[PDB]
Amino acid sequence: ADYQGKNVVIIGLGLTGLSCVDFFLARGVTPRVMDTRMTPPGLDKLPEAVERHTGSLNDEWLMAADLIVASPGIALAHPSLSAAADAGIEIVGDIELFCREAQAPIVAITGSNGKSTVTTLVGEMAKAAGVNVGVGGNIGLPALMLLDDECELYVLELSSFQLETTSSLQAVAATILNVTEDHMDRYPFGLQQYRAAKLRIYENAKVCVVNADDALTMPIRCVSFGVNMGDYHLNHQQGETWLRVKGEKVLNVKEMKLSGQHNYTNALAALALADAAGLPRASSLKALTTFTGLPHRFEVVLEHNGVRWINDSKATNVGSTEAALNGLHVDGTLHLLLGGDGKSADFSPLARYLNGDNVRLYCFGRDGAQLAALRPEVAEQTETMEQAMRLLAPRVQPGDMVLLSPACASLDQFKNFEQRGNEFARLAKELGSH
Numbered sequence: 001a002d003y004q005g006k007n008v009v010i011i012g013l014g015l016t017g018l019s020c021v022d023f024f025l026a027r028g029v030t031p032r033v034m035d036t037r038m039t040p041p042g043l044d045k046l047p048e049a050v051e052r053h054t055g056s057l058n059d060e061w062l063m064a065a066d067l068i069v070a071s072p073g074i075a076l077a078h079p080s081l082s083a084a085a086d087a088g089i090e091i092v093g094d095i096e097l098f099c100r101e102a103q104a105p106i107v108a109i110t111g112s113n114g115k116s117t118v119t120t121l122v123g124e125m126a127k128a129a130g131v132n133v134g135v136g137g138n139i140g141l142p143a144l145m146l147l148d149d150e151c152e153l154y155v156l157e158l159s160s161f162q163l164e165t166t167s168s169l170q171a172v173a174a175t176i177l178n179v180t181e182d183h184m185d186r187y188p189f190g191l192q193q194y195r196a197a198k199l200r201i202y203e204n205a206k207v208c209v210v211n212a213d214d215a216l217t218m219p220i221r222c223v224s225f226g227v228n229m230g231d232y233h234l235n236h237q238q239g240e241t242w243l244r245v246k247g248e249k250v251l252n253v254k255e256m257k258l259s260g261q262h263n264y265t266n267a268l269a270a271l272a273l274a275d276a277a278g279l280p281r282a283s284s285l286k287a288l289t290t291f292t293g294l295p296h297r298f299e300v301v302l303e304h305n306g307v308r309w310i311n312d313s314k315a316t317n318v319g320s321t322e323a324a325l326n327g328l329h330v331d332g333t334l335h336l337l338l339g340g341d342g343k344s345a346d347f348s349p350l351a352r353y354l355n356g357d358n359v360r361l362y363c364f365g366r367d368g369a370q371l372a373a374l375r376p377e378v379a380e381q382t383e384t385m386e387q388a389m390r391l392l393a394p395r396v397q398p399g400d401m402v403l404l405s406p407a408c409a410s411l412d413q414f415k416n417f418e419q420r421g422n423e424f425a426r427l428a429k430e431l432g433s434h
Protein backbone atom coordinates (compact mmCIF):
# COMPACT_ATOMS: atom_id res chain seq x y z
CA ALA A 1 0.00 0.00 0.00
CA ASP A 2 1.07 3.63 -0.54
CA TYR A 3 -0.20 6.18 1.99
CA GLN A 4 1.71 9.16 0.71
CA GLY A 5 -0.46 12.25 0.48
CA LYS A 6 -3.36 10.72 2.43
CA ASN A 7 -5.24 12.31 5.34
CA VAL A 8 -4.94 9.58 8.01
CA VAL A 9 -6.79 9.54 11.31
CA ILE A 10 -5.84 7.11 14.07
CA ILE A 11 -8.40 6.36 16.79
CA GLY A 12 -6.92 5.30 20.14
CA LEU A 13 -3.63 5.98 21.85
CA GLY A 14 -1.63 3.50 23.90
CA LEU A 15 1.21 1.29 22.68
CA THR A 16 -0.77 0.14 19.65
CA GLY A 17 -2.03 3.62 18.72
CA LEU A 18 1.58 4.78 19.12
CA SER A 19 2.84 2.00 16.88
CA CYS A 20 0.40 3.25 14.23
CA VAL A 21 1.59 6.86 14.62
CA ASP A 22 5.20 5.70 14.24
CA PHE A 23 4.33 3.49 11.23
CA PHE A 24 2.90 6.46 9.29
CA LEU A 25 5.55 8.96 10.36
CA ALA A 26 8.34 6.59 9.17
CA ARG A 27 6.57 6.58 5.81
CA GLY A 28 6.44 10.37 5.56
CA VAL A 29 2.78 10.67 6.50
CA THR A 30 1.75 12.76 9.51
CA PRO A 31 -1.49 11.26 10.89
CA ARG A 32 -3.84 12.87 13.38
CA VAL A 33 -4.88 11.04 16.54
CA MET A 34 -8.11 11.05 18.55
CA ASP A 35 -9.24 9.10 21.62
CA THR A 36 -12.62 9.32 23.40
CA ARG A 37 -10.93 9.09 26.78
CA MET A 38 -10.32 12.44 28.41
CA THR A 39 -6.81 11.30 29.38
CA PRO A 40 -5.55 8.29 27.32
CA PRO A 41 -2.42 6.16 28.05
CA GLY A 42 0.76 7.24 26.26
CA LEU A 43 -0.56 10.71 25.49
CA ASP A 44 2.75 12.00 26.83
CA LYS A 45 4.65 9.65 24.52
CA LEU A 46 2.96 11.20 21.47
CA PRO A 47 5.36 13.43 19.51
CA GLU A 48 4.56 17.16 19.78
CA ALA A 49 4.23 17.49 15.99
CA VAL A 50 1.27 15.08 15.88
CA GLU A 51 -2.13 16.81 16.23
CA ARG A 52 -4.45 15.11 18.70
CA HIS A 53 -8.04 15.40 19.92
CA THR A 54 -9.11 13.77 23.21
CA GLY A 55 -12.28 13.30 25.26
CA SER A 56 -14.49 12.45 22.25
CA LEU A 57 -14.31 11.56 18.59
CA ASN A 58 -13.93 14.55 16.26
CA ASP A 59 -16.36 14.12 13.34
CA GLU A 60 -14.76 17.00 11.44
CA TRP A 61 -11.50 15.03 11.31
CA LEU A 62 -13.16 11.69 10.64
CA MET A 63 -15.32 12.89 7.77
CA ALA A 64 -12.25 14.64 6.22
CA ALA A 65 -10.08 11.51 6.34
CA ASP A 66 -8.90 9.35 3.45
CA LEU A 67 -8.14 6.46 5.88
CA ILE A 68 -9.24 5.80 9.45
CA VAL A 69 -7.15 3.42 11.52
CA ALA A 70 -9.36 2.23 14.36
CA SER A 71 -8.00 0.74 17.62
CA PRO A 72 -9.65 -2.54 18.51
CA GLY A 73 -10.87 -0.60 21.54
CA ILE A 74 -13.38 1.51 19.59
CA ALA A 75 -16.53 -0.17 18.22
CA LEU A 76 -17.02 -0.06 14.43
CA ALA A 77 -20.67 0.45 15.27
CA HIS A 78 -19.92 3.76 17.02
CA PRO A 79 -22.18 6.32 15.24
CA SER A 80 -19.18 8.46 14.16
CA LEU A 81 -17.49 5.47 12.52
CA SER A 82 -20.60 4.15 10.89
CA ALA A 83 -21.19 7.63 9.45
CA ALA A 84 -17.68 7.56 7.99
CA ALA A 85 -18.21 4.02 6.62
CA ASP A 86 -21.48 5.12 4.98
CA ALA A 87 -19.56 7.92 3.30
CA GLY A 88 -17.18 5.37 1.80
CA ILE A 89 -14.21 6.28 3.99
CA GLU A 90 -11.84 3.34 4.35
CA ILE A 91 -11.47 1.94 7.91
CA VAL A 92 -8.73 -0.49 8.87
CA GLY A 93 -6.84 -1.43 12.02
CA ASP A 94 -3.20 -2.06 12.92
CA ILE A 95 -3.37 -5.71 11.93
CA GLU A 96 -4.56 -4.75 8.44
CA LEU A 97 -1.68 -2.30 8.07
CA PHE A 98 0.72 -5.05 9.21
CA CYS A 99 -0.66 -7.73 6.82
CA ARG A 100 -0.22 -5.37 3.84
CA GLU A 101 3.50 -5.01 4.64
CA ALA A 102 4.58 -8.32 6.13
CA GLN A 103 7.22 -10.27 4.14
CA ALA A 104 7.11 -13.57 5.98
CA PRO A 105 4.34 -16.13 6.57
CA ILE A 106 1.85 -15.46 9.37
CA VAL A 107 0.46 -17.95 11.82
CA ALA A 108 -2.74 -16.42 13.20
CA ILE A 109 -4.41 -17.48 16.49
CA THR A 110 -7.71 -16.37 18.04
CA GLY A 111 -10.19 -17.85 20.55
CA SER A 112 -11.94 -17.05 23.82
CA ASN A 113 -9.27 -18.86 25.93
CA GLY A 114 -5.83 -20.30 25.18
CA LYS A 115 -4.77 -17.86 22.48
CA SER A 116 -1.76 -16.28 24.32
CA THR A 117 -0.51 -19.72 25.41
CA VAL A 118 -0.82 -21.15 21.91
CA THR A 119 0.73 -18.03 20.32
CA THR A 120 3.67 -18.19 22.71
CA LEU A 121 4.12 -21.93 22.24
CA VAL A 122 4.26 -21.69 18.44
CA GLY A 123 6.83 -18.86 18.88
CA GLU A 124 8.92 -21.17 21.05
CA MET A 125 8.59 -23.98 18.49
CA ALA A 126 9.94 -21.59 15.84
CA LYS A 127 12.84 -20.49 18.09
CA ALA A 128 13.74 -24.13 18.73
CA ALA A 129 14.02 -24.66 14.94
CA GLY A 130 16.34 -21.64 14.72
CA VAL A 131 13.78 -19.58 12.82
CA ASN A 132 13.86 -15.78 13.23
CA VAL A 133 10.31 -15.26 14.56
CA GLY A 134 8.24 -12.24 15.52
CA VAL A 135 5.61 -13.00 18.16
CA GLY A 136 2.97 -10.49 19.28
CA GLY A 137 -0.21 -8.79 18.21
CA ASN A 138 -2.80 -8.79 20.93
CA ILE A 139 0.01 -9.80 23.25
CA GLY A 140 3.65 -8.68 23.57
CA LEU A 141 4.48 -6.08 20.96
CA PRO A 142 1.81 -4.54 18.81
CA ALA A 143 2.19 -6.25 15.46
CA LEU A 144 3.61 -3.20 13.66
CA MET A 145 6.55 -3.22 16.12
CA LEU A 146 7.45 -6.72 14.88
CA LEU A 147 7.88 -5.77 11.21
CA ASP A 148 11.46 -6.61 10.24
CA ASP A 149 12.98 -7.75 6.91
CA GLU A 150 14.96 -10.49 8.64
CA CYS A 151 11.87 -12.03 10.21
CA GLU A 152 11.16 -15.46 8.71
CA LEU A 153 7.85 -16.19 10.47
CA TYR A 154 5.26 -14.10 12.36
CA VAL A 155 3.02 -15.61 15.01
CA LEU A 156 0.13 -13.30 15.89
CA GLU A 157 -2.44 -13.46 18.65
CA LEU A 158 -5.51 -11.78 17.21
CA SER A 159 -8.64 -10.61 19.01
CA SER A 160 -12.16 -10.70 17.58
CA PHE A 161 -11.96 -6.85 17.53
CA GLN A 162 -8.76 -6.76 15.50
CA LEU A 163 -10.23 -9.26 13.08
CA GLU A 164 -13.31 -7.04 12.42
CA THR A 165 -11.02 -4.41 10.82
CA THR A 166 -8.74 -6.84 8.94
CA SER A 167 -9.31 -7.85 5.30
CA SER A 168 -5.85 -8.77 3.90
CA LEU A 169 -4.70 -11.59 6.21
CA GLN A 170 -3.67 -14.70 4.30
CA ALA A 171 -2.39 -16.86 7.15
CA VAL A 172 -0.15 -19.85 6.46
CA ALA A 173 -2.09 -21.45 9.31
CA ALA A 174 -5.01 -20.02 11.29
CA THR A 175 -7.04 -21.21 14.26
CA ILE A 176 -10.04 -20.37 16.39
CA LEU A 177 -9.26 -22.36 19.54
CA ASN A 178 -12.77 -22.12 21.01
CA VAL A 179 -15.71 -19.68 21.17
CA THR A 180 -17.35 -19.05 24.50
CA GLU A 181 -19.41 -16.07 25.53
CA ASP A 182 -17.25 -12.91 25.92
CA HIS A 183 -17.30 -9.21 24.97
CA MET A 184 -21.09 -9.13 24.86
CA ASP A 185 -20.89 -5.41 25.62
CA ARG A 186 -19.36 -5.04 22.12
CA TYR A 187 -21.60 -7.58 20.31
CA PRO A 188 -25.26 -6.61 20.57
CA PHE A 189 -26.11 -9.38 18.10
CA GLY A 190 -24.79 -11.84 20.64
CA LEU A 191 -22.77 -15.01 20.38
CA GLN A 192 -23.04 -15.52 16.63
CA GLN A 193 -21.87 -11.95 15.93
CA TYR A 194 -18.81 -12.46 18.17
CA ARG A 195 -18.18 -15.82 16.43
CA ALA A 196 -18.47 -14.21 13.00
CA ALA A 197 -15.72 -11.76 13.87
CA LYS A 198 -13.43 -14.69 14.76
CA LEU A 199 -14.39 -16.66 11.62
CA ARG A 200 -12.76 -13.90 9.59
CA ILE A 201 -9.36 -15.38 10.54
CA TYR A 202 -9.90 -18.34 8.19
CA GLU A 203 -10.47 -16.23 5.08
CA ASN A 204 -7.68 -16.99 2.60
CA ALA A 205 -5.78 -19.07 5.18
CA LYS A 206 -3.70 -21.83 3.62
CA VAL A 207 -4.45 -24.27 6.45
CA CYS A 208 -7.35 -23.86 8.93
CA VAL A 209 -6.99 -25.54 12.30
CA VAL A 210 -10.28 -26.18 14.11
CA ASN A 211 -11.37 -27.58 17.47
CA ALA A 212 -13.13 -30.92 16.91
CA ASP A 213 -14.86 -30.44 20.29
CA ASP A 214 -16.22 -26.94 19.59
CA ALA A 215 -18.48 -26.66 16.54
CA LEU A 216 -18.42 -22.84 16.67
CA THR A 217 -14.74 -22.95 15.68
CA MET A 218 -15.66 -24.43 12.29
CA PRO A 219 -16.25 -22.35 9.20
CA ILE A 220 -19.92 -21.88 8.22
CA ARG A 221 -10.94 -29.44 4.73
CA CYS A 222 -9.67 -28.05 8.05
CA VAL A 223 -7.10 -29.83 10.20
CA SER A 224 -8.57 -30.59 13.61
CA PHE A 225 -7.50 -31.04 17.18
CA GLY A 226 -9.51 -32.52 20.03
CA VAL A 227 -9.54 -34.64 23.14
CA ASN A 228 -10.89 -37.97 21.94
CA MET A 229 -11.31 -37.11 18.28
CA GLY A 230 -9.41 -35.04 15.67
CA ASP A 231 -6.31 -35.21 13.49
CA TYR A 232 -4.37 -34.12 16.59
CA HIS A 233 -5.75 -35.71 19.76
CA LEU A 234 -5.01 -37.21 23.16
CA ASN A 235 -4.52 -40.93 23.95
CA HIS A 236 -5.08 -41.83 27.62
CA GLN A 237 -3.07 -44.79 28.95
CA GLN A 238 -3.57 -45.84 32.59
CA GLY A 239 -3.06 -42.43 34.21
CA GLU A 240 -0.79 -41.31 31.37
CA THR A 241 -1.65 -38.96 28.53
CA TRP A 242 -0.05 -38.76 25.11
CA LEU A 243 -0.28 -36.24 22.32
CA ARG A 244 -0.97 -38.10 19.07
CA VAL A 245 -1.14 -37.17 15.39
CA LYS A 246 -3.44 -39.50 13.37
CA GLY A 247 -2.90 -42.56 15.58
CA GLU A 248 0.84 -41.96 16.12
CA LYS A 249 2.17 -41.11 19.60
CA VAL A 250 4.36 -38.01 19.50
CA LEU A 251 4.71 -36.94 23.17
CA ASN A 252 4.02 -38.30 26.63
CA VAL A 253 2.75 -35.24 28.49
CA LYS A 254 4.88 -36.10 31.53
CA GLU A 255 7.64 -34.37 29.53
CA MET A 256 5.63 -31.12 29.47
CA LYS A 257 5.95 -28.52 32.23
CA LEU A 258 2.30 -27.45 31.58
CA SER A 259 -0.42 -29.68 33.02
CA GLY A 260 -4.16 -30.05 32.64
CA GLN A 261 -6.33 -31.18 29.74
CA HIS A 262 -6.88 -27.73 28.24
CA ASN A 263 -3.12 -27.22 28.16
CA TYR A 264 -2.72 -30.52 26.37
CA THR A 265 -5.21 -29.39 23.76
CA ASN A 266 -3.38 -26.04 23.53
CA ALA A 267 -0.23 -28.07 22.83
CA LEU A 268 -2.04 -30.03 20.07
CA ALA A 269 -3.26 -26.82 18.48
CA ALA A 270 0.23 -25.34 18.65
CA LEU A 271 1.72 -28.45 17.03
CA ALA A 272 -0.91 -28.42 14.28
CA LEU A 273 -0.12 -24.78 13.46
CA ALA A 274 3.63 -25.38 13.64
CA ASP A 275 3.35 -28.41 11.32
CA ALA A 276 1.30 -26.39 8.83
CA ALA A 277 3.89 -23.60 8.99
CA GLY A 278 6.59 -26.12 7.96
CA LEU A 279 8.44 -26.22 11.29
CA PRO A 280 10.32 -29.46 12.02
CA ARG A 281 8.23 -31.70 14.29
CA ALA A 282 11.23 -32.65 16.42
CA SER A 283 12.13 -29.09 17.52
CA SER A 284 8.45 -28.33 18.04
CA LEU A 285 8.18 -31.21 20.50
CA LYS A 286 11.32 -29.97 22.23
CA ALA A 287 9.67 -26.54 22.71
CA LEU A 288 6.73 -28.28 24.36
CA THR A 289 9.04 -29.68 27.04
CA THR A 290 10.68 -26.40 27.94
CA PHE A 291 7.68 -24.03 27.95
CA THR A 292 6.78 -22.99 31.54
CA GLY A 293 3.55 -21.08 31.02
CA LEU A 294 2.65 -17.39 31.05
CA PRO A 295 2.42 -14.99 34.06
CA HIS A 296 -1.17 -14.65 35.35
CA ARG A 297 -2.21 -17.93 33.71
CA PHE A 298 -3.06 -20.30 36.55
CA GLU A 299 0.25 -19.26 38.01
CA VAL A 300 1.33 -20.48 41.45
CA VAL A 301 2.67 -17.35 43.08
CA LEU A 302 3.06 -18.80 46.58
CA GLU A 303 3.02 -22.34 47.94
CA HIS A 304 3.70 -22.11 51.66
CA ASN A 305 2.38 -23.51 54.94
CA GLY A 306 0.13 -25.95 53.14
CA VAL A 307 -1.63 -23.32 50.99
CA ARG A 308 -1.38 -22.75 47.23
CA TRP A 309 -2.07 -19.17 46.11
CA ILE A 310 -2.84 -19.16 42.37
CA ASN A 311 -2.86 -16.07 40.16
CA ASP A 312 -5.23 -16.77 37.24
CA SER A 313 -5.88 -13.08 36.61
CA LYS A 314 -5.85 -13.77 32.86
CA ALA A 315 -9.28 -15.44 33.34
CA THR A 316 -11.30 -12.50 32.03
CA ASN A 317 -14.30 -14.55 30.93
CA VAL A 318 -16.53 -17.36 32.20
CA GLY A 319 -15.05 -20.03 29.89
CA SER A 320 -11.58 -19.30 31.26
CA THR A 321 -12.70 -19.62 34.89
CA GLU A 322 -14.55 -22.78 33.93
CA ALA A 323 -11.27 -24.17 32.56
CA ALA A 324 -9.58 -23.44 35.90
CA LEU A 325 -12.36 -25.08 37.98
CA ASN A 326 -13.23 -28.09 35.82
CA GLY A 327 -11.50 -31.13 37.31
CA LEU A 328 -9.72 -28.93 39.88
CA HIS A 329 -8.31 -30.86 42.85
CA VAL A 330 -8.39 -29.11 46.26
CA ASP A 331 -7.51 -30.91 49.47
CA GLY A 332 -9.26 -28.48 51.81
CA THR A 333 -11.30 -25.39 50.96
CA LEU A 334 -11.17 -23.44 47.71
CA HIS A 335 -11.25 -19.69 48.34
CA LEU A 336 -12.23 -18.30 44.93
CA LEU A 337 -11.93 -14.62 44.05
CA LEU A 338 -14.43 -13.46 41.41
CA GLY A 339 -15.01 -9.93 40.26
CA GLY A 340 -14.64 -6.88 38.04
CA ASP A 341 -16.44 -5.96 34.79
CA GLY A 342 -18.30 -9.05 33.59
CA LYS A 343 -19.12 -7.48 30.20
CA SER A 344 -22.79 -8.58 30.55
CA ALA A 345 -21.77 -12.27 30.62
CA ASP A 346 -24.01 -15.02 31.98
CA PHE A 347 -22.11 -16.26 35.02
CA SER A 348 -24.55 -19.21 35.45
CA PRO A 349 -22.24 -21.82 33.91
CA LEU A 350 -19.92 -21.41 36.92
CA ALA A 351 -22.56 -22.53 39.45
CA ARG A 352 -22.12 -26.26 38.79
CA TYR A 353 -18.54 -26.02 40.08
CA LEU A 354 -19.45 -24.28 43.28
CA ASN A 355 -21.41 -26.98 45.17
CA GLY A 356 -20.42 -28.76 48.37
CA ASP A 357 -18.85 -27.94 51.71
CA ASN A 358 -15.38 -26.87 50.52
CA VAL A 359 -15.99 -23.68 48.50
CA ARG A 360 -16.06 -20.03 49.56
CA LEU A 361 -16.55 -17.10 47.20
CA TYR A 362 -15.16 -13.65 47.63
CA CYS A 363 -16.71 -11.32 45.13
CA PHE A 364 -15.65 -7.78 44.25
CA GLY A 365 -15.61 -4.99 41.65
CA ARG A 366 -18.38 -3.80 39.40
CA ASP A 367 -20.27 -7.10 39.15
CA GLY A 368 -19.47 -8.47 42.60
CA ALA A 369 -23.11 -8.68 43.60
CA GLN A 370 -24.09 -10.78 40.54
CA LEU A 371 -21.17 -13.08 41.25
CA ALA A 372 -22.08 -13.55 44.90
CA ALA A 373 -25.59 -14.53 43.72
CA LEU A 374 -24.22 -17.72 42.15
CA ARG A 375 -24.30 -19.15 45.70
CA PRO A 376 -25.14 -16.52 48.34
CA GLU A 377 -24.70 -18.89 51.31
CA VAL A 378 -20.96 -19.30 50.71
CA ALA A 379 -20.26 -15.83 49.30
CA GLU A 380 -18.90 -12.54 50.64
CA GLN A 381 -18.90 -9.27 48.67
CA THR A 382 -16.41 -6.43 48.98
CA GLU A 383 -15.68 -3.35 46.92
CA THR A 384 -12.09 -4.30 46.06
CA MET A 385 -9.85 -7.33 45.56
CA GLU A 386 -7.60 -6.18 48.42
CA GLN A 387 -10.57 -6.12 50.78
CA ALA A 388 -11.52 -9.60 49.62
CA MET A 389 -7.96 -10.92 50.17
CA ARG A 390 -7.75 -9.48 53.67
CA LEU A 391 -11.19 -10.97 54.40
CA LEU A 392 -10.32 -14.48 53.25
CA ALA A 393 -6.75 -14.73 54.56
CA PRO A 394 -7.63 -15.35 58.25
CA ARG A 395 -9.85 -18.26 57.16
CA VAL A 396 -7.20 -20.07 55.12
CA GLN A 397 -6.17 -23.47 56.56
CA PRO A 398 -3.41 -25.92 55.51
CA GLY A 399 -4.71 -27.87 52.50
CA ASP A 400 -6.60 -24.84 51.14
CA MET A 401 -6.23 -23.13 47.76
CA VAL A 402 -6.69 -19.41 47.18
CA LEU A 403 -7.56 -18.88 43.49
CA LEU A 404 -7.87 -15.55 41.69
CA SER A 405 -9.83 -16.54 38.53
CA PRO A 406 -12.20 -13.68 38.34
CA ALA A 407 -14.25 -14.40 35.16
CA CYS A 408 -14.28 -10.66 34.36
CA ALA A 409 -12.23 -7.84 32.90
CA SER A 410 -10.12 -5.86 35.40
CA LEU A 411 -10.68 -2.53 33.72
CA ASP A 412 -13.19 -1.08 36.23
CA GLN A 413 -10.50 -0.98 38.92
CA PHE A 414 -7.12 -1.80 37.32
CA LYS A 415 -5.01 -0.78 34.32
CA ASN A 416 -5.13 -4.38 33.06
CA PHE A 417 -5.21 -8.01 34.20
CA GLU A 418 -1.43 -7.94 34.74
CA GLN A 419 -1.76 -5.19 37.33
CA ARG A 420 -4.57 -7.16 39.00
CA GLY A 421 -2.38 -10.32 39.03
CA ASN A 422 0.62 -8.43 40.32
CA GLU A 423 -1.40 -6.89 43.18
CA PHE A 424 -2.81 -10.31 44.03
CA ALA A 425 0.69 -11.79 44.16
CA ARG A 426 1.97 -8.99 46.42
CA LEU A 427 -0.96 -9.54 48.79
CA ALA A 428 -0.58 -13.34 48.68
CA LYS A 429 3.03 -12.98 49.79
CA GLU A 430 2.09 -10.58 52.60
CA LEU A 431 -0.90 -12.60 53.84
CA GLY A 432 0.43 -16.11 53.15
CA SER A 433 3.35 -16.21 55.60
CA HIS A 434 3.95 -15.19 59.23
Ligand SMILES: O=C(O)CC[C@@H](NC(=O)c1cccc(COc2cccc(/C=C3\SC(=O)NC3=O)c2)c1)C(=O)O
Nearest residue numbers: 012014035036037071072073161316409410411416417
Ligand atom coordinates in the same frame (compact mmCIF):
# COMPACT_ATOMS: atom_id res chain seq x y z
O1 LIG B 1 -7.03 -6.66 31.04
C1 LIG B 1 -8.20 -6.98 31.37
O2 LIG B 1 -8.58 -7.12 32.55
C2 LIG B 1 -9.25 -7.29 30.35
C3 LIG B 1 -8.76 -7.18 28.93
C4 LIG B 1 -10.03 -6.85 28.14
N1 LIG B 1 -9.70 -6.32 26.84
C5 LIG B 1 -10.60 -5.73 26.06
O3 LIG B 1 -11.80 -5.74 26.30
C6 LIG B 1 -10.03 -5.07 24.85
C7 LIG B 1 -10.64 -5.15 23.61
C8 LIG B 1 -10.06 -4.54 22.50
C9 LIG B 1 -8.86 -3.85 22.63
C10 LIG B 1 -8.25 -3.77 23.87
C11 LIG B 1 -6.96 -3.02 24.04
O4 LIG B 1 -7.19 -1.90 24.91
C12 LIG B 1 -7.40 -0.65 24.38
C13 LIG B 1 -6.49 -0.15 23.46
C14 LIG B 1 -6.68 1.12 22.93
C15 LIG B 1 -7.78 1.87 23.30
C16 LIG B 1 -8.70 1.37 24.20
C17 LIG B 1 -9.90 2.17 24.64
C18 LIG B 1 -10.36 3.39 23.85
S1 LIG B 1 -9.70 3.93 22.30
C19 LIG B 1 -10.87 5.25 22.37
O5 LIG B 1 -10.96 6.13 21.45
N2 LIG B 1 -11.72 5.34 23.41
C20 LIG B 1 -11.45 4.32 24.24
O6 LIG B 1 -12.11 4.17 25.34
C21 LIG B 1 -8.51 0.11 24.76
C22 LIG B 1 -8.83 -4.38 24.98
C23 LIG B 1 -10.90 -8.08 28.05
O7 LIG B 1 -10.55 -9.00 27.28
O8 LIG B 1 -11.94 -8.09 28.75
Ligand SMILES: O=S([O-])[O-]
Nearest residue numbers: 013014015016017
Ligand atom coordinates in the same frame (compact mmCIF):
# COMPACT_ATOMS: atom_id res chain seq x y z
O1 LIG C 1 -1.82 0.14 22.79
S1 LIG C 1 -2.30 -0.99 23.58
O2 LIG C 1 -1.29 -1.34 24.57
O3 LIG C 1 -3.55 -0.60 24.25
Ligand SMILES: [Cl-]
Nearest residue numbers: 036056057058
Ligand atom coordinates in the same frame (compact mmCIF):
# COMPACT_ATOMS: atom_id res chain seq x y z
CL1 LIG D 1 -17.55 10.89 20.72
